[PDB]
Amino acid sequence: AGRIASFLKNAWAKEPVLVASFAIGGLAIILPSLSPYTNYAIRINRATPYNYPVPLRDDGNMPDVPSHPQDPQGPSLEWLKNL
Amino acid sequence: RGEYVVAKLDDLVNWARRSSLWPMTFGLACCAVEMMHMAAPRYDMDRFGVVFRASPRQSDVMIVAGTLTNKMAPALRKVYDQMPEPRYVVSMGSCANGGGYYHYSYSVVRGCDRIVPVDIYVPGCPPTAEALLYGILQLQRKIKREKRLRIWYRR
Amino acid sequence: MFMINILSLIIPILLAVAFLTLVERKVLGYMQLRKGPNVVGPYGLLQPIADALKLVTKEPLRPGTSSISMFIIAPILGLSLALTMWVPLPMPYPLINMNLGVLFMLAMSSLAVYSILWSGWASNSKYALIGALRAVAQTISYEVTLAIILLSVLLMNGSYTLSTLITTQEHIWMIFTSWPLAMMWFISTLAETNRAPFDLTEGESELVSGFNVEYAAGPFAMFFMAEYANIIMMNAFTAILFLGASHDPHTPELYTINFVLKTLALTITFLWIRASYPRFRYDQLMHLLWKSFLPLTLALCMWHISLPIMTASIPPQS
Amino acid sequence: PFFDVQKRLGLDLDRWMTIQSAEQPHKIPGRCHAFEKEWIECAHGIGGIRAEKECKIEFDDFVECLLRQKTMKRLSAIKRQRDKLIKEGKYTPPPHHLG
Amino acid sequence: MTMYIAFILSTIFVIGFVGFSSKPSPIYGGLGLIVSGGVGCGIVLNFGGSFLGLMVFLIYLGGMLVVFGYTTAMATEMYPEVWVSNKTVFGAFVSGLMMEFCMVYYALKEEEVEIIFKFNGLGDWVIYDTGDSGFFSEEAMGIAALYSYGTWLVIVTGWSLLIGVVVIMEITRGN
Amino acid sequence: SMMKWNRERRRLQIEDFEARIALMPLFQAEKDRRVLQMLRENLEEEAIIMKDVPDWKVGESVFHTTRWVTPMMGELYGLRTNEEILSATYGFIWYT
Amino acid sequence: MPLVYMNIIMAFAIALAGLLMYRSHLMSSLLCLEGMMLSLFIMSTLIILNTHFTLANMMPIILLVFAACEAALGLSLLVMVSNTYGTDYVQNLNLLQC
Amino acid sequence: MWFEILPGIAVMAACLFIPGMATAHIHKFTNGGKEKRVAHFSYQWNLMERDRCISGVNRYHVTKGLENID
Amino acid sequence: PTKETAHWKPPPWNDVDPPKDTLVSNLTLNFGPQHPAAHGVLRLVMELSGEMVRKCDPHIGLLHRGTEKLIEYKTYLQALPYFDRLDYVSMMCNEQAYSLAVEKLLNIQPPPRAQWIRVLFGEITRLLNHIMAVTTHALDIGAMTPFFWMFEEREKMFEFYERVSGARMHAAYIRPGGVHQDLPLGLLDDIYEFSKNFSFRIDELEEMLTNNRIWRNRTVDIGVVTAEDALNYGFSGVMLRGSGIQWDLRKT
Amino acid sequence: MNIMLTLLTNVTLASLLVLIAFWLPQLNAYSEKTSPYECGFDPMGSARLPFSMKFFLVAITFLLFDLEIALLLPLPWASQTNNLKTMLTMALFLLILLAASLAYEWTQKGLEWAE
Ligand SMILES: COC1=C(OC)C(=O)C(C/C=C(\C)CC/C=C(/C)CC/C=C(/C)CC/C=C(\C)CC/C=C(/C)CC/C=C(\C)CC/C=C(\C)CC/C=C(\C)CC/C=C(/C)CCC=C(C)C)=C(C)C1=O
Ligand code: SF4
C-alpha cells in the first residue's frame, strides 16, 4: 500500500526515464489484446488482393460465389469504406 | 609576358594566405590574457578571418605571448619546428621580444628571437589588445607584399 | 544528361558546405556578441574561398611514423561516403529511387567509423589513438539508437521507400506523432556528427582533436568537408522525416523551397545548441544512451509497433 | 529426426520451411514447385533406398530445374557453334536478333 | 562492355578475399574482407537481393568495425605488421591470383572445368528466371515471414542472444 | 490524423490493386504470346544453326517430363542483341 | 553451375586455407573465420534468391545472427588470452602442453 | 544586427536550392514533360517495358492513346 | 620418456601457472607542455589505469622567472611592478598586499581616501579575477558564450584601469603610503552605471550554468575535498570556503 | 549503370581532391618535421602500445545488440501479414528480449563502463 506508492514516487523521481519506459512498454503489450480494432486490422490485411483471385470452374450449385464481378452476392468490404 | 599571369596568380595566393592566418595562441603570461581580451567581443579578432583557436599542425602564425623561460625553450622549439610552412611568428610583449622586466634573470631567455625567428615585433607590457591587432594587420600587409611565384619565375 | 544531374548534386552541396563554414562563424559570433567575418568581401561572403585556397596551398605534411596508404584512403572514404550518402534524398523527385533508401543511407551512415579508425591509427599519435577509439565508440553506440528510432518511425510510414515518406506526412507533421522519438533522434544525430555538446573527440584539453590531428591542408580539409556535409545531410534527413512539407506534382519547386528552409532551420538549431551547451564527458556520454536513451527508445519502438495494430491503421506497404 | 517430437505431440516446428512447395507467403511459388511436387508425391511412404530408383527421372528433372546444368550446357554448345560459323562467316542473324 | 560485371563482381570478390586470407597485418586482412564484402553486396544486389545486400552491408561493416576495435586495443604492438613485411605473403597473394585465373581461362576455352564439381563458363546472366512480382518484393516478403512462420527461429535466436550476452558477461568478467 | 489518413491510403492501395487485377489478364495474354514468339524464333533460327552439327537433335527437351515448363530466360534472350539481354536481366535492378 | 558459384566456393576454399593454415596471428585467423561465413552467406543467398525459396529468404540473416555471435565470443576470448600473455601471437600459446 | 547573417545563409539556401529543381526539371525534361515513372515493383517495370515496346521509339515516356489503335 | 620429454615440466597442483612477468602498467602521460588548455604553461606527468587517475605529478617552473631573486636588487619603489606582473588577473590585489607590507614596516598608515580607493579597486580586481576563473573554466568544460559575454565587461573594467593609472592591465597604482594619484573626474559615475548593469548579466551567466544539467553533471560532486584535510594542505580562499570552513581574511 | 555511375563520379571526384591536396603544395622536406607531436612534446615511446582498456565490453555488447537490431529490421514488411496477432506477440518477444539483455547488462555491471 504505502510502500508500493512510495516506491512508485521515488522511481518517478530517482529514475524518471525508467518509469516512463516501463509504463509505455507495459501498455504496449496489454492494449492490443484489449483494443477492439485489431480484428479490423486483420480484415485490412486480408482485404488487399496482392495476387489475382483465380476463378473457380463453374458447374452449378455454388450460389455463394458470384457469377460476375459486378454481382451483388459475394464478399464485400463496405466496412472498409466506412472505416 | 609571364609576369602578368604569375603576378595575378601569386597575388591571389598571398591574399588567400593573408586573410586566413590562424594563430597558434601560445600564451605564457599576462600577454596571453591581453590577447584573450583582443579576441573578446570588443575587438573581435575572429572577424578578420583569424581564428585564434588552432592546433599547431593546422596553424599559420605563432604569437609568443609572455615571458619565455629556459625550461619552456625546448617545447617552443619543438612546436615551431613542427609548424607547417608558411610560418610567421609574431612576438608580443617586451618580455617575448627581448628580455623584458626579467631581462637579467637566470632562467629566462633574453628574447624569442634567440629561440625562434620573429616576423613582427609587438611592443607593450602588455601590448594593449588593439596594438596586438595592429601587429596582426601589419603581418597581413606583409603577406600582401609576397612575391613567391614572381621570384620562382625570375630565379 | 544523367551525369549532369549528378554534378548538379555534388557541386552545389560543395558550395553549401563551403558557406556553412562562414555561417557557423557568423552565427556563433552573433550568439556570443561577435560581428563574425565581414572583411573578406561583402559581409564575409568571400571568406570561405580564402581559407579553402590557403588549405589547398598549405603544405600537407606526411606523418613520418605512418603508412601513407590509410593516411590517403581515410579522407577518400570520409568524403566520398558523405557525398554519395546524399544520393537517395527525396527532393520533390529524388535522384535515385532506391526502394530501401532509408536503410541504404542508414547503412552508409555507419561507414564514418571506417574513416575515423584509419585516421586515428595510421597517423600514429597518442591523441589520435585515443580519439579514434573514443569517437568510434561514440558513433557506434549511437548508431543503434538511430536504428531503432528509424524503424519505429518507419513502422507508420509503410516501407523503406524514402520517396513515399512525403506521402506519409502530407496532412500533419510527423513529429506530432513521434515528438518523443524525434527528440531522441535529433540528439543522437548531434552525437553521431561529433558536435560540441557531444563531440568528445576534439576535447581541447586531453584529446585536442582526436582524429584530425596530424592531418594537414587537403586531407585535413576533406574530413571537415565530410563532417560539415553530414551536418546538412542529417538535418535534411530529420527535416523530411519529421518536419513534413507540401508537394504539388505540377509545381515541384514548392517542396524544394520548403525542404531547404527546413534544412537551414535545423542546421541553425545545430549551431544554436553548440554555441551554448557545455561538452559531455565520455563517462556521461555513454551513460546518456546506455542508461537513459536506449530503454526509452526500446519502449517507444514497442509502443509504435503495437499502435498501428490496435488502431487498425497499418500503413500501406506499396 | 532422431526423436521426432514434432509429429508425436502434434505441431510443426521447422517442417514449414523444409521444402519449397509448402504454403509460401502470399502464395509465391518456388522456381521448381511443379518438379518438387512431382518428386515428393512420387516418393511418399516408399522408403528412401527404394524410392531413390523409382523416383529417379523426377529427381534429375528436379535437379535440372534447380541448376539448369544440361540446359545451360546446351545453350553453351549452341553459342559455340554460332560464334564459330559467324567468325568463319556463312549467314547473318535475322533482324529479330538485331533490332 | 559492362556485360561481364555480374561476373567480375565475383572475381574482385575472389582476389580481395585472398589478400584478406593472405595472412597480412590484421587491418589489411580487414581491408581485404571489406572490399570483398563491398563487391559481394553487388553480387547479391544485382540478383535481386536488395534487402539482404544492404543488410549484410550494415551488420558486416559494423562487425569488422568491432573486430578492429580490439585490433588497436588487444592486437597491436610496438611494430605493427605491414602488408609487405613478411616475404611469404607475396607468394600467398600470387598463388591467390593465378589459380582462379587459370581456371577461368579454361572455362573461357572449354566451358567444362573439371575442378571439384561441374561448372560452365557461360557467364551468369542465363541462370536468372523470367516472371514477375506483382506489387511485392519476394525477398522482403520472405524475410518478413519471420514473424509469422518463423515460429521457432526467432524464439531460438533470441534465447541464444540472451545466452550470448550472458557468456560475454561471464568470460570477460575477470573474477 | 495518421489513423484516418492511413485508412485512406489503404483505400487507395486496394483501388490501385483492383486496377492491377483488372489488367493482369491482358498482360498475361500478351506475355505468353511474346515468350512463345521468342521460343519459336530461337527454334527456327537454331534449326539452321544446327544442320551442320552431326549429333544435335533439333528442338530437343532436356526434361523427361512432357509438361511445359517456364522457359529458362537464357534460351529466351539467347542469340539476341547484348543490350536486349542486359535490359531483360538487370533492368529492374539497375533502374532508378 | 555458373562462374559466380565457382567464385564464392573458391573464396570459401581459400578462407578455409587462410584461417586453418595459421601463419602467426590469432586475431587475423578469426578474421579469416568470419570472412568464411561471409562467403557462405553470399553463397546461401544466391540459390535462395535464384529458386524463389520465399521462406528460406529468412535463413541468411538467421545464419548471420549466430555467426557473428561466434566472433562475438572469439575476439572476446582474444582479449582474455591477451591481457595475461600480452599479444595474440600464437606461438607463446604453449602453456597447456601436458 | 542579425541580418548580416542573412547573406551568409542566403547563398547557402541557393546552394541547397539547386539540387531541388535540377533533379526535378531534368526528370520533367527527360520524360516528355511527365515526371519520372518510378518502378518500385516488377509490375511497374513490366508496364514500363510494354510502354517502351508499344511506343516504337524505344522511349517509354512517349505515350499514344486510342488514336494509335483502330 | 625418450628425449624431449625431459623438457616437459609437470603442471602445478592448482592448475594455475606462476603468474608471468608483471604487465601492470598505467601508461604514463605527459599531458603537455605547450597544452594551451592550461593558460599556456603546465606539465602533468599522469599515471592512470586508463581513466581513473592514479597519481599525478604537476611540473611548475615552465614559466619560471627569477623574480624572487630579482627583488633584492631594486628598491621597493622599483620592486612594486613585480607584484603587478605576478598574479596577472588580480593586479591591484597583489599591489595592495605588497604596499600594505611596505608601509606596515614603516609604521605608516595611508590616508582614509587612499584606503577607500584601495578597497574599491581591489574589489574591481576581485570581479575581474572571478570572471577569469568562471569563464575560462566554462571554456575548458565547453561553454564558449559566457567567456565573451563577461569578457566585454572585463574590457569595461580595463577601461577604468586605464583611466586611473594609465595602463589598462598593469596599473602600478597602489604604492606604499597610499595610491599614486587621484581618480579622474567622472570615474565614479561610470563605475555606478557599470555596477547597475552588471548584476543583470551575472544572473544571466548563472542561469546558463547554475541549473544546467550537463554543467552540474560534469562538475557536481567531482573531486570532493574534506574540510579537515583542506586546511592542513594549506588550501586557502574559496578552496576553504567551498569545503565549509567559515574563514575570510576580509572579515576576520 | 545509373547508381554505379553516381558512385564512380563521387569516388573519382574525391580522389581528384586528395590528389590536388597531396601534390599541388611544395614542401622543403627537412628531417626534423618528422618528429611526432603531443601538446608541444612528442608522444615519447607510445601511440602504438597495446591499449589496456575497459570499454571493450561496451564495444562487444554493441555488436550483440546489432544482431538483434538486424533481426527486428524486417518489421515494416512484417506488419503486412494476415496473422497479425502472432506477429505482435513475437515482435514484442523480440523487444522484451532486447530489454532483458540490457537489464542483465545493467545490474551485472556490464554496460557499466568498466573501471
Ligand atoms: C585560462 O585558461 C584557459 C584554458 O584552459 C585552462 C583554455 O583551455 C584556453 C583555450 C581556449 C581557446 C583557444 C578558446 C578559443 C576561442 C575562440 C574565439 C577561437 C575559436 C572560434 C570559433 C568560432 C570556434 C570554431 C570551431 C569550430 C566550428 C569547431 C571546432 C572543431 C574542429 C574540428 C575545427 C578545427 C579547425 C579546422 C578543421 C580548420 C577549418 C578548416 C576549414 C574551414 C576548411 C574549409 C574548406 C572549404 C570551404 C572547402 C570548399 C571551398 C570552396 C571554395 C568551395 C568551392 C570549390 C569547389 C571545388 C567547387 C584558454 C584561452 C584559457 O584562457
Ligand atoms: S611583456 Fe609585460 S605583460 Fe608581457 S609577459 Fe612580460 S611582464 Fe607580462
Residue numbers in the entry:
A (entry chain 1b): 1 to 83
B (entry chain 1B): 25 to 179
C (entry chain 1H): 1 to 318
D (entry chain 1e): 1 to 99
E (entry chain 1J): 1 to 175
F (entry chain 1Z): 49 to 144
G (entry chain 1K): 1 to 98
H (entry chain 1a): 1 to 70
Question: What did the authors write?
Answer:
A key group of these are the respiratory chain supercomplexes (SCs); these which primarily consist of complexes I, III2 and IV (CI, CIII2 and CIV) in varying stoichiometries, which serve as the minimal functional units for NADH:O2 oxidoreduction. Here we report in situ structures of porcine respiratory SCs, determined directly through imaging porcine mitochondria by single-particle analysis combined with cryo-electron tomography (cryo-ET). Our structures, with an average resolution of approximately 2.5 Å and local resolution up to 1.8 Å in the best regions, enable in-depth study of mitochondrial respiratory SCs in their native states. Our in situ structures also capture numerous reactive intermediates within these respiratory supercomplexes, shedding light on the dynamic processes of the ubiquinone/ubiquinol exchange mechanism in complex I and the Q-cycle in complex III.
The Q-binding site in CI features an unusually long, heterogeneous channel structure. The three other states show not only conformational differences in the Q10 headgroup and the key residue H59NDUFS2 but also long-range structural changes away from the Q10 headgroup and along the whole Q10. In state β, the Q headgroup is angled away from the Fe–S cluster N2 relative to state α, although the tail region largely remains similar to that in state α. These conformational changes result in an M-distance of 16 Å and an E-distance of 38.6 Å. In addition, active-apo and all different Q/QH2-binding states were dominantly in the closed conformation (except state β), implying that the closed form may be sufficient for the catalytic cycle. Taken together, our findings support a model in which Q10 progresses through the Q channel by peristaltic motion.
